[PDB]
Design an enzyme around this catalytic site. Structure first.
Site, PDB file in Angstrom:
ATOM      1  N   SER C  13       0.792  -1.228   0.000  1.00 31.61           N
ATOM      2  CA  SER C  13       0.000   0.000   0.000  1.00 31.61           C
ATOM      3  C   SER C  13       0.831   1.288   0.000  1.00 31.61           C
ATOM      4  O   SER C  13       0.292   2.388   0.157  1.00 31.61           O
ATOM      5  CB  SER C  13      -0.978   0.009   1.183  1.00 31.61           C
ATOM      6  OG  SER C  13      -2.043  -0.908   0.972  1.00 31.61           O
ATOM      7  N   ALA C  14       2.143   1.164  -0.185  1.00 28.89           N
ATOM      8  CA  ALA C  14       2.993   2.344  -0.225  1.00 28.89           C
ATOM      9  C   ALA C  14       2.777   3.087  -1.547  1.00 28.89           C
ATOM     10  O   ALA C  14       3.104   4.266  -1.660  1.00 28.89           O
ATOM     11  CB  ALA C  14       4.452   1.954  -0.068  1.00 28.89           C
ATOM     12  N   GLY C  15       2.236   2.393  -2.549  1.00 31.96           N
ATOM     13  CA  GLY C  15       1.970   3.030  -3.824  1.00 31.96           C
ATOM     14  C   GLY C  15       2.749   2.541  -5.036  1.00 31.96           C
ATOM     15  O   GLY C  15       2.673   3.142  -6.112  1.00 31.96           O
ATOM     16  N   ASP C  37       4.059  -9.857  -6.423  1.00 33.45           N
ATOM     17  CA  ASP C  37       2.657 -10.206  -6.585  1.00 33.45           C
ATOM     18  C   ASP C  37       2.339 -10.999  -7.855  1.00 33.45           C
ATOM     19  O   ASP C  37       1.558 -11.962  -7.807  1.00 33.45           O
ATOM     20  CB  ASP C  37       1.785  -8.961  -6.489  1.00 33.45           C
ATOM     21  CG  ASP C  37       1.676  -8.446  -5.072  1.00 33.45           C
ATOM     22  OD1 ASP C  37       2.020  -9.220  -4.150  1.00 33.45           O
ATOM     23  OD2 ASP C  37       1.247  -7.290  -4.871  1.00 33.45           O
TER      24      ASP C  37
HETATM   25  O1  LIG Z   1      -1.277  -9.337  -0.802  1.00 29.66           O
HETATM   26  C1  LIG Z   1      -0.371  -9.623  -1.573  1.00 29.66           C
HETATM   27  N1  LIG Z   1       0.906  -9.124  -1.589  1.00 29.66           N
HETATM   28  C2  LIG Z   1       1.356  -8.102  -0.607  1.00 29.66           C
HETATM   29  C3  LIG Z   1       2.428  -7.184  -1.275  1.00 29.66           C
HETATM   30  O2  LIG Z   1       1.900  -6.607  -2.520  1.00 29.66           O
HETATM   31  C4  LIG Z   1       1.869  -8.769   0.739  1.00 29.66           C
HETATM   32  O3  LIG Z   1       2.122  -7.687   1.637  1.00 29.66           O
HETATM   33  C5  LIG Z   1       3.244  -9.449   0.539  1.00 29.66           C
HETATM   34  C6  LIG Z   1       4.488  -8.879   0.985  1.00 29.66           C
HETATM   35  C7  LIG Z   1       5.705  -9.544   0.752  1.00 29.66           C
HETATM   36  C8  LIG Z   1       5.677 -10.823   0.049  1.00 29.66           C
HETATM   37  N2  LIG Z   1       7.047 -11.413  -0.142  1.00 29.66           N
HETATM   38  O4  LIG Z   1       8.023 -10.650   0.021  1.00 29.66           O
HETATM   39  O5  LIG Z   1       7.138 -12.577  -0.455  1.00 29.66           O
HETATM   40  C9  LIG Z   1       4.514 -11.421  -0.396  1.00 29.66           C
HETATM   41  C10 LIG Z   1       3.279 -10.765  -0.171  1.00 29.66           C
HETATM   42  C11 LIG Z   1      -0.660 -10.684  -2.737  1.00 29.66           C
HETATM   43 CL1  LIG Z   1      -0.845 -12.234  -2.056  1.00 29.66          CL
HETATM   44 CL2  LIG Z   1      -2.242 -10.238  -3.398  1.00 29.66          CL
END
Ligand SMILES: O=C(N[C@H](CO)[C@H](O)c1ccc([N+](=O)[O-])cc1)C(Cl)Cl
Ligand SMILES: O=C(N[C@H](CO)[C@H](O)c1ccc([N+](=O)[O-])cc1)C(Cl)Cl
Ligand SMILES: O=C(N[C@H](CO)[C@H](O)c1ccc([N+](=O)[O-])cc1)C(Cl)Cl
Ligand SMILES: O=C(N[C@H](CO)[C@H](O)c1ccc([N+](=O)[O-])cc1)C(Cl)Cl
Ligand SMILES: O=C(N[C@H](CO)[C@H](O)c1ccc([N+](=O)[O-])cc1)C(Cl)Cl
Ligand SMILES: O=C(N[C@H](CO)[C@H](O)c1ccc([N+](=O)[O-])cc1)C(Cl)Cl
Ligand SMILES: O=C(N[C@H](CO)[C@H](O)c1ccc([N+](=O)[O-])cc1)C(Cl)Cl
Ligand SMILES: O=C(N[C@H](CO)[C@H](O)c1ccc([N+](=O)[O-])cc1)C(Cl)Cl
Lengths: 178, 178, 178, 178
Positions: C13-15, C37
């Site tokens: 949500s940082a943008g 994502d």
């Molecule tokens: O919610 C999601 N992703 C957010 C980041 O956009 C979640 O905060 C996240 C953060 C880190 C991450 N990682 O580093 O593997 C995976 C998901 C997807 Cl599953 Cl829809």
């Protein structure tokens, strides 16, 4: 005898949404579509984490509380009001309460001309599609495949187990009185 | 003889994405999925309005220019590189150029072990599903249903006209060497 | 000195996604976008329920296991391979491991010219946007807002707390060498 | 003096949907959300290709015909009926017809207690966000930014140009009588 509302009932992944879009394309007059899912999307997100709201078990079960039911009620009345106002309405529902659910609708509908549609599909097959779509909680399809129709009376029944949406759409449209 | 990549080819609405998720669920080892559609989503939006990019005729036709093709190329190489790096990759494609397209892939793949899958579906039926999903340009299904396979050689062929995704998934998995 | 990859790092949500689309629109040459994502969406659904995969705590925490990490690795290599093949790549990531994460990237990148971008945003504000979007697990924003940058070195830093995406896009584009 | 409906009006990308979800989270009682967009999604797809329906110019303009307007009318009545039935309703609209549009609502609402909310945002900034979201027709934001409020009277006004959704939500909630 003009049909004002088309209420479809079926378990998750049985094929309703697909049939709905087909109906909207097939039917000559414009039909608005709404359902338990659009209602859910319209309810506050927190309703999904509140006890008297709606809860999704990890195994695919679905529980409905009074807070949720209360809202749904006013919603149902509004949809009927749209029909009364002259909008052709299609309702994509899921009678978790079987006959009880159909009664609930009958109460809101009153003497409005409604086409009760049943959308069936083999649990196993529904469960397969559930996996293929990947956007539902695994297990909903099977749990809903049958209990949903027990004691429910339809004017038309389609079975998507071996019939495409567009075909089922044609069967349903045929019973729609202009 | 271990399978490194599973490349599926089929026309729009033939059922590929559904088969892909099923494969990911069925196959024991994790398989990454990518396709012409995820590639499109990854390309800048403007690519869809630029001449040498990708254009969607109103009747459902699809045109591809060199700017688009160039990008796709580097993308293809990257996907192959992922396989080489040890990731099991599934590619959901649409050989608009028929045999020409398969060749393009063969060039990027090299001596990498690939399972060429063909996903067929009656044009009429695909067109029906196209309507039911409501999120594609009407006409793509029919235009692609056949020309896409002309001159293409597969190791396995599934036809979704009368087979569920999960079933087609089972047929395809059976040819995957661990 | 031509920039081959633009790697952005920021908390949920940082943008970032908003900045990414702006960059794709602003930058003259086509840039492909990928991120943690899109990688997740490409991984099998079950990866999200498997211990050595990725797990989402109910409070918004995120845990990553070796099975997930292994896959991500081959993916990273593939993306770098795309850059090498001549595709301009933008990576929307989330360095949960802070500096450790940036190192992981440095290893895959090698001597490839990369523009390291930092996307900051006040935790409280990020948390607010998290609510407004309604499609993330409440709590991710805050948990990630800061720990993600600790020990990370950027070539450019933007803060969306009071700057629109398009503006941040302009600041970042300015550091992109053609 | 209990508020039954909260009707928000603003141009595309002004920030309404974001404010809506925040309101649903903030407000203690459950509020159902609906809008011109959910209505569109509920109307048949073909309505978007029919002359007296809704048309989207390539430059971002939006035209509404009588067939569309007629349907919308019955829909409006239904929503009011939901309020009457006791459901708290939030309406996310876009008064293309300015004052004319507000009148249309006043007619359907009657003596029902409604909170008229205005959501403003600098055209330039809205246009920037339009690009960042990438899922609207470029040009809608600017075309709507102002004409939408001309002659419209609100009980509360928020400007998202420099205020987060959650903040605007707080300002609006404060005027909601339980
Ligand atoms: O919610 C999601 N992703 C957010 C980041 O956009 C979640 O905060 C996240 C953060 C880190 C991450 N990682 O580093 O593997 C995976 C998901 C997807 Cl599953 Cl829809
Ligand atoms: O998954 C969802 N809905 C399906 C039905 O489409 C779920 O099976 C379900 C079934 C019944 C129900 N109800 O009757 O209140 C709600 C959700 C939505 Cl939450 Cl996305
Ligand atoms: O606000 C909440 N709960 C109380 C009861 O603790 C409340 O009465 C309620 C439940 C669901 C709901 N909804 O759907 O918006 C609204 C209020 C929880 Cl969702 Cl945090
Ligand atoms: O509609 C889309 N894609 C379908 C295929 O899934 C379209 O039929 C299509 C076909 C071929 C193609 N190509 O080969 O470059 C691109 C899009 C995406 Cl733009 Cl959403
Ligand atoms: O930027 C554009 N075009 C030129 C040619 O006028 C350009 O070379 C280009 C085309 C597509 C593209 N893309 O996919 O990002 C990028 C640049 C148009 Cl999309 Cl506005
Ligand atoms: O298949 C599974 N697990 C085993 C370990 O029990 C497996 O090695 C695995 C974990 C995640 C995964 N993925 O992402 O596809 C694949 C296989 C569970 Cl997801 Cl059911
Ligand atoms: O793009 C869409 N809607 C936006 C508003 O959210 C479009 O600007 C619009 C504006 C006004 C309108 N109307 O008043 O009938 C319909 C669509 C939907 Cl088609 Cl996705
Ligand atoms: O069916 C159509 N048109 C006629 C007029 O040619 C019709 O009266 C109509 C227009 C829009 C519509 N809708 O939204 O479903 C329905 C019927 C076109 Cl959409 Cl193909």
């Amino acid at each position: 005898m003009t049909t004002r509302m088309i209420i479809l009932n079926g378990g998750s992944s049985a094929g309703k949404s697909g049939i709905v879009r087909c109906l909207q394309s097939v039917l000559p007059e414009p039909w608005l579509a709404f359902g338990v899912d659009s209602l859910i999307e319209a309810m506050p997100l927190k309703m999904q984490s509140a006890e008297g709201g709606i809860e999704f078990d990890a195994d695919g079960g679905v529980s409905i509380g009074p807070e949720f039911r209360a809202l749904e009620g006013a919603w149902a009345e509004g949809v009927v009001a749209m029909a009364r106002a002259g909008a052709r309405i299609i309702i994509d529902d899921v009678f978790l309460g079987g006959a009880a659910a159909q009664e609930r609708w009958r109460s809101f509908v009153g003497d409005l001309d409604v086409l009760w549609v049943g959308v069936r599909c083999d649990g196993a097959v529904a469960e397969g599609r559930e996996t293929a779509r990947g956007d539902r909680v695994a297990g909903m399809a099977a749990k809903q495949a049958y209990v949903v129709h027990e004691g429910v009376e339809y004017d038309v029944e389609v079975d998507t187990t071996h019939k495409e949406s567009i075909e089922c759409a044609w069967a349903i449209a045929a019973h729609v009185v202009p």
